[PDB]
Design an enzyme around this catalytic site. Structure first.
Site, PDB file in Angstrom:
ATOM      1  N   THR A   1       3.121  12.094 -27.443  1.00 40.50           N
ATOM      2  CA  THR A   1       2.651  12.213 -28.945  1.00 40.50           C
ATOM      3  C   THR A   1       1.502  12.636 -29.595  1.00 40.50           C
ATOM      4  O   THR A   1       0.987  11.245 -28.927  1.00 40.50           O
ATOM      5  CB  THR A   1       3.449  11.910 -30.064  1.00 40.50           C
TER       6      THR A   1
ATOM      7  N   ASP B   1      12.642   4.054 -20.934  1.00 45.67           N
ATOM      8  CA  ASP B   1      12.552   5.481 -21.686  1.00 45.67           C
ATOM      9  C   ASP B   1      11.223   5.784 -20.622  1.00 45.67           C
ATOM     10  O   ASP B   1      10.026   5.895 -20.837  1.00 45.67           O
ATOM     11  CB  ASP B   1      12.342   6.202 -22.457  1.00 45.67           C
TER      12      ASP B   1
ATOM     13  N   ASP C   1       3.650   5.632 -22.314  1.00 47.93           N
ATOM     14  CA  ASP C   1       4.295   6.392 -23.063  1.00 47.93           C
ATOM     15  C   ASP C   1       5.135   4.747 -24.168  1.00 47.93           C
ATOM     16  O   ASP C   1       6.648   4.690 -24.334  1.00 47.93           O
ATOM     17  CB  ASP C   1       5.577   6.791 -22.522  1.00 47.93           C
TER      18      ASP C   1
ATOM     19  N   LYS D   1       5.733   3.858 -26.976  1.00 48.50           N
ATOM     20  CA  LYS D   1       6.197   4.335 -28.593  1.00 48.50           C
ATOM     21  C   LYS D   1       6.928   3.238 -29.426  1.00 48.50           C
ATOM     22  O   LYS D   1       8.339   2.478 -28.461  1.00 48.50           O
ATOM     23  CB  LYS D   1       6.620   5.780 -28.532  1.00 48.50           C
TER      24      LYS D   1
ATOM     25  N   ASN E   1      10.955   3.177 -27.908  1.00 49.43           N
ATOM     26  CA  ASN E   1      11.508   2.890 -26.755  1.00 49.43           C
ATOM     27  C   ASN E   1      11.586   2.061 -26.260  1.00 49.43           C
ATOM     28  O   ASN E   1      11.685   1.793 -24.945  1.00 49.43           O
ATOM     29  CB  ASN E   1      10.814   3.757 -25.859  1.00 49.43           C
TER      30      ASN E   1
END
EC number: 2.7.11.19
Lengths: 144, 376, 754
Positions: free
Chosen positions: B178, B159, B141, B143, B146
């Site tokens: 995503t 996160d 994750d 991104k 974050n």
């Protein structure tokens, strides 16, 4: 891709540019190095080149910027132009040829401390045909 | 999981700092020392609209998150869990207060970033990723949303809601995140169940994608249709714009190509990436010895650089207002001003989700009859 | 606080509010901010000015005349005389709390500007006037030319203030003697308060239902010493305070109560009374029929009480549970209500600590007020058709027709024993309407009864206080209005009725959307940026258009769907469109043109461009450059004129492209250093850019179908669909057209450098 030997050569070159070890090229050191070869552009020209090379207005040059500049591939025509200008720098005497005395004078001007045996040995090792002279093809092939 | 009385008599909430899907972040003070902090209040009941299986699974997820973040604590570039309080209806998670927002607003305001800060953020992210992989922990994750920024340009990952431990010899077969940041291995897991699994390669792909979007300013892969975007990703034919990257070095572009590799095995690791000449630097050394050929090469390089610097300075062109009459996009200042003004005019239609993105503002395509051919 | 009013950037009289008299200010950071601002802006040489551009006592203006002509271009600039009263305020302000060095500095400064009269006693002059001859020098060198005393100078106000300040500084008197009420401790923070909430059941069935889920409550009975009544009876009680017959005094007029007043207990003739909050009143409006809004206003009201609570003792809130709060089958409470109950249990709900219990325990610890002033000293055929027929629709139609034609108060004689008035039947219909939850005629009957929402004036003044202009009514002029100043309740109701005309439901919808904005700006005052003027009617038409596009239906169906939505749906859609979250680009351009969301620094750039040109013509109408010297960017009139000039065109896409073209003019003007000396036509630039785009597309080889022409524009739709930036965006075409137009009126030389 890049190799350790070329990293060492680039680091040695960058150290040679900066006479006093500070971590920055600095306008004054660039100016004195540039006047050493026999060029006298103005102060505003120096800041303009500094701004062009740098990504911002800090007015300083670090190692990554020099590594980026030197790793550029200049295509073909710009390459002959640059090597011709470098040759003319080494060819101050109107002969078209590089002698041991000329290289000794160049290295003394740039601020290097060696002996005559060193220049004789390096001009002998670099030379191929054994006439004590380096030609255009030999110069362009050894560039790297 | 102490009683709520301790939290009530120890921390006093303050004004709202942000909002989320089901949680809001508030500012709090520590009465003994008056130190500021940020508290995340999670409503496990979801306002009473959640069936109790949902409440149970949310509680299990947050317990897994707290006990997986307990081990990671210690790294300077990671979020610090200071205190935990648990009730039958609320969870109070206290982290450090950062100061400002994360990368999205900064990138939107500044349009595009330069290489100076890029080197630092990439180095820090690579160090964090290497540390996480050494601990046999994955995230899946990364991104830009974050990663938080401090007043001194400090980044720390947060996160971890999708992070989970990976037993050696195992191959996960789960799909999340995503679609634009989905590696080809995850999507191959989606279509075909025979594929063994994925690993840290999705992390490298995400790092390459975020690097691409911070450098170019637009995501490498994006389209109005999900299926065509997935086919675009599967093809793996990312292209370089002509009047966009004519002022960037070759080393950075080589690193771009090296990060994004279709083959999982050929993808570079964090240790291999850290050894690239892009991050090369020197402090002091005096053991440089070589043959006379080395001396000649170094002196020739010095002379060549000294000559080339003046010519590179001379290669500047004037304003050329006539060229502005013909084409203003060629000049870099004109392009940057047009871009910044377009962003400030249309700055409040860039938010989360695939429906709206930064790539929807730029139109480098030659809008014409060629738009008729879209897909099969 | 930072600005004295909407017309003055700063007035020095704000010092008195934030100094020795009447300390009313919080968040001292604002105090230092305003002090630094007034010091850096209004400080002079021998005094300070009241405010910028006041002409009182000046060698111009013809003091014999009043009612200033609108020609204050430079005749009242940098020649505001002086006022040492604000200086002598500073010494007291410094000496009051803890400051001594500033007191010495101000005393030394003020002693130099003193004048000695008879008997050698201090005297404070009113002001010093600029000499009538040395006026041009001051315009170039402000605060340099000496002034002379002029005017009345037995100024007792400043003299008495200075005498009191000197006496205070001498130490004969202490600061604690001047104010026995201890008003110097208004900056001391208060940690928090704890809110007490009691829950009561209306009947036995509700008590059983709550006890089923584990909630222990108590019914309205069994607490015989304690009685609970609504707040309107309390208002009728308070409407008798200070009433005298001999002096013709009617006492306190009727008004609505806040929740801050109903929380505290009361004593009336050795009896305890508790009053429910005013928002659970279903006899006034229908927004209290929705559980979601009940929860939302509970949250905001608990937060509001927990914030200030400047009274002694803990609060007390009574929340009776009503029959309308049950589900459809009437055997269980709604999920939201049960969730809220479980939420204020465990001592955390909303943004406050909530503690529950029984009124018996709260009695010993709660603020109580002792009250002493209440101590004793063929229409028959139509009626038959209505009686026999069914359906709520025809019911509403026939009742409205009878009320409008002959039945404002006439008895229908529908029931032979009881006189049934039209109003009685209409108010009885509410009982049947509320059970079916049909938002199809409740607003219709409410319009017939003309119900008014309370505290509407408060919402309007809160809207106006944000440097905002309101506007009621659909376009166009002159039926459209402009509420630039607060108005009384009756005047406001009459104005909104006149604006809404006979469409009746428009008034109710305007009131509802106004109330929605009203509770919205307080929570999130950030989405109202990029806006200067709101129109309720324009928002309504945008709502109808958006709903029609979503449902792909006609306008009538969209209106029917909109009027049937629950109020929570209107709040959600209003928030959605306020956030902002071919067919894609054109729709967004249309929305932007409708909401005319001009950039933050738009007016400043327009002013800067107008500084270097003769004006900006827009289809005949011209904006002369002489406006720049009679006006400043900070004030409102320039924004009003700019919007009026830009609002001549009705098409939203036109106004957006005009904004884009004038902004590209703004950016392109910076590169060159020249004066155009000519008027600029933006429409011509737009047409030139369009022609260039069409020529380029034709050169590429596109077929004629995509290069379409709008029925009344002359502009290709693909231009509207085109994104602004990029190598093929509209910005490049606009810049090229603007540069070509600039070259067309330039003396054969650009000379652009940057």
């Amino acid at each position: 891709q890049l190799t350790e030997e070329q990293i060492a050569e680039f680091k040695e070159a960058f150290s040679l540019f900066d006479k006093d070890g500070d971590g920055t090229i600095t306008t004054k050191e660039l100016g004195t190095v540039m006047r050493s070869l026999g060029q006298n552009p103005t102060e505003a020209e120096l800041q303009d080149m500094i701004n062009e090379v740098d990504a911002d207005g800090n007015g300083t040059i670090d190692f990554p910027e020099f590594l980026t500049m030197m790793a550029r591939k200049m295509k073909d025509t710009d390459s002959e132009e640059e090597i011709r200008e470098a040759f003319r720098v080494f060819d101050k005497d109107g002969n078209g040829y590089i002698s041991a005395a000329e290289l000794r004078h160049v290295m003394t001007n740039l601020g290097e401390k060696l002996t005559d045996e060193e220049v004789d040995e390096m001009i002998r090792e670099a030379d191929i045909d054994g006439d004590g002279q380096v030609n255009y093809e030999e110069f362009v092939q050894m560039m790297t | 999981s102490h009683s709520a009385q301790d939290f009530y008599e120890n921390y006093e909430p303050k004004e709202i700092l942000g909002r989320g899907v089901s949680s809001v972040v508030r500012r709090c003070i520590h009465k003994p020392t008056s130190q500021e902090y940020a508290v995340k209040v999670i409503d496990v009941t979801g306002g009473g609209s959640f069936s109790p299986e949902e409440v149970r699974e949310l509680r299990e997820a947050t317990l897994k998150e707290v006990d997986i973040l307990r081990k990671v604590s210690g790294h300077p570039n990671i979020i610090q869990l200071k205190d935990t309080y648990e009730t039958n209806t609320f969870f109070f998670l206290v982290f450090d207060l950062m100061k400002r927002g994360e990368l999205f607003d900064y990138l939107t305001e500044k349009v595009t970033l330069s290489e100076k800060e890029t080197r630092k953020i990439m180095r820090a992210l690579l160090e964090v990723i290497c540390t996480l992989h050494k601990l046999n922990i994955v995230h899946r994750d990364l991104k830009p949303e974050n990663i938080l920024l401090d007043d001194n340009m400090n980044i720390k990952l947060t996160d971890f809601g999708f992070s989970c431990q990976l037993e050696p010899g195992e191959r996960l077969r789960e799909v999340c995140g995503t679609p634009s940041y989905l590696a080809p291995e995850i999507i191959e897991c989606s279509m075909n169940e025979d594929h063994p699994g994925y690993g840290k390669e999705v992390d490298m792909w995400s790092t390459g994608v975020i690097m691409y979007t911070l450098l170019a300013g637009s995501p490498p892969f994006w389209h109005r249709k999900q299926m065509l975007m997935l086919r675009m990703i599967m093809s793996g034919n990312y292209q370089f714009g002509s009047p966009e990257w004519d002022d960037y070095s070759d080393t950075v572009k080589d690193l771009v190509s090296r990060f994004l590799v279709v083959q999982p095995q050929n993808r570079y690791t964090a240790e291999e990436a850290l050894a690239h000449p892009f991050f090369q630097q020197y402090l002091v050394e005096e053991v440089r010895h070589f043959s006379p050929r080395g001396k000649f090469k170094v002196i020739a390089l010095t002379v060549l650089a000294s000559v080339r610097i003046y010519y590179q300075y001379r290669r500047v062109k004037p304003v050329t207002r006539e060229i502005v009459i013909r084409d203003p996009y060629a000049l870099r200042p004109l392009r940057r001003l047009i871009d910044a003004y377009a962003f400030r005019i249309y700055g409040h239609w860039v938010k989360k989700g695939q429906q709206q993105n930064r790539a929807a503002l730029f139109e480098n395509t030659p809008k014409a009859v060629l738009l008729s051919l879209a897909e099969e | 606080l930072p600005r004295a009013s909407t017309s003055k950037e700063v007035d020095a009289s704000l010092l008195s509010v934030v100094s020795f008299p009447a300390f009313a200010v919080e968040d001292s950071q604002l105090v230092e901010l305003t002090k630094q601002e007034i010091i850096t802006k209004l400080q002079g040489r021998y005094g300070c000015c009241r405010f910028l551009r006041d002409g009182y006592k000046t060698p111009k203006e013809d003091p014999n005349r009043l009612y200033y002509e609108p020609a204050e271009l430079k005749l009242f600039e940098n020649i505001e005389c002086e006022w040492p009263l604000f200086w002598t305020y500073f010494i007291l302000d410094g000496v009051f709390s803890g400051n001594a060095e500033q007191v010495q500095e101000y005393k030394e400064a003020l002693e130099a500007v003193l004048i000695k009269g008879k008997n050698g006693v201090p005297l404070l002059p009113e002001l010093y006037s600029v000499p009538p001859d040395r006026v041009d020098e001051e315009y170039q060198n402000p605060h340099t030319v000496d002034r002379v005393p002029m005017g009345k100078l037995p100024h007792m106000w400043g003299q008495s203030l200075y005498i009191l300040g000197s006496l205070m500084a001498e130490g004969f008197l202490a600061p604690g003697e001047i104010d026995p009420l201890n008003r110097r401790f208004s900056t001391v923070p208060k940690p928090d308060v704890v809110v007490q909430v009691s829950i009561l059941a209306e009947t036995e069935e509700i008590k059983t239902i709550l006890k089923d889920k584990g909630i222990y409550v108590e019914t309205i009975a069994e607490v015989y010493p304690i009685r609970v009544q609504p707040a309107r009876i309390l208002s009728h009680i308070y409407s008798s305070l200070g009433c005298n017959n001999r002096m013709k005094l009617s006492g306190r007029p009727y008004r609505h109560m806040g929740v801050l007043g109903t929380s505290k207990l009361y004593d009336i003739r050795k009896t305890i009374f508790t009053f429910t909050p005013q928002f659970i009143d279903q006899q006034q409006f229908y927004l209290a029929l929705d559980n979601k809004m009940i929860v939302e206003m509970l949250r905001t009201d608990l937060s509001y009480l927990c914030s200030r609570w400047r009274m002694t003792g803990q609060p007390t809130i009574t929340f009776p549970i009503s029959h309308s709060m049950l589900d459809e089958d009437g055997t269980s409470l709604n999920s939201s209500i049960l969730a809220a109950l479980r939420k204020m249990q465990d001592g955390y709900f909303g943004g406050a600590r909530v503690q529950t219990g029984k009124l018996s325990e709260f009695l010993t610890t709660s603020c109580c007020t002792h009250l002493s002033f209440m101590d004793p000293g063929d229409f028959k055929a139509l009626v038959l058709q209505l009686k026999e027929t069914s359906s709520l629709q025809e019911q509403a139609d026939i009742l409205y027709m009878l009320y409008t034609m002959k039945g404002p108060d006439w008895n229908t004689e529908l029931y032979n024993e009881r006189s049934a008035t039209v109003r009685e039947l209409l108010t009885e219909l509410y009982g049947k309407v509320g059970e079916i939850r049909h938002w199809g005629l409740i607003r219709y009957i409410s319009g017939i009864l003309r119900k008014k929402v309370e505290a509407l004036d408060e919402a309007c003044t809160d809207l106006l206080s944000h440097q905002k202009h309101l506007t009621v009514g659909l376009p166009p002029e002159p039926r459209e209005k402009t509420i630039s100043a607060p108005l009384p309740y009756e005047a406001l109701t009459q104005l909104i009725d006149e604006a809404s005309e006979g469409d009746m439901s428009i008034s109710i919808l305007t009131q509802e959307i106004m109330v929605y904005l009203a509770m919205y700006m307080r929570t999130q005052p950030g989405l109202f940026a990029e806006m200067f003027r709101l129109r309720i009617g324009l928002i309504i038409q945008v709502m109808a258009t958006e709903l029609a596009h979503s449902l792909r239906c006609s306008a009538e169906e969209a209106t029917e769907g909109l009027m049937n939505l629950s109020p929570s749906a209107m709040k959600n859609l209003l928030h959605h469109i306020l956030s902002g979250k071919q067919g894609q680009w054109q729709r967004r351009r249309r929305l932007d043109g409708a909401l005319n969301r001009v950039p933050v620094g738009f007016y400043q750039k327009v002013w800067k461009v107008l500084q270097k040109c003769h004006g900006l013509s827009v289809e005949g109408f011209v904006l002369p450059s002489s406006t720049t010297r009679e006006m400043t960017p900070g004030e409102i009139k320039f924004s009003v004129h700019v919007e009026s000039v830009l609002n001549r065109v009705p098409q939203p896409e036109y106004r957006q492209l005009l904004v884009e073209a004038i902004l590209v003019l703004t950016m392109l003007a910076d590169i060159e250093i020249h004066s155009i000396g000519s008027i600029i036509a933006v429409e011509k630039i737009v047409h030139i850019a369009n022609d260039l785009f069409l020529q380029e597309q034709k050169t590429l080889g596109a077929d004629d179908t995509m290069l379409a022409k709008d029925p009344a524009s002359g502009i290709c739709t693909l231009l509207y669909d085109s994104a602004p930036s990029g190598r093929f965006g509209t910005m490049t075409y606009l810049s090229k057209a603007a540069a070509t137009y600039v070259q067309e009126f330039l003396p054969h030389s650009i000379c652009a450098m940057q």
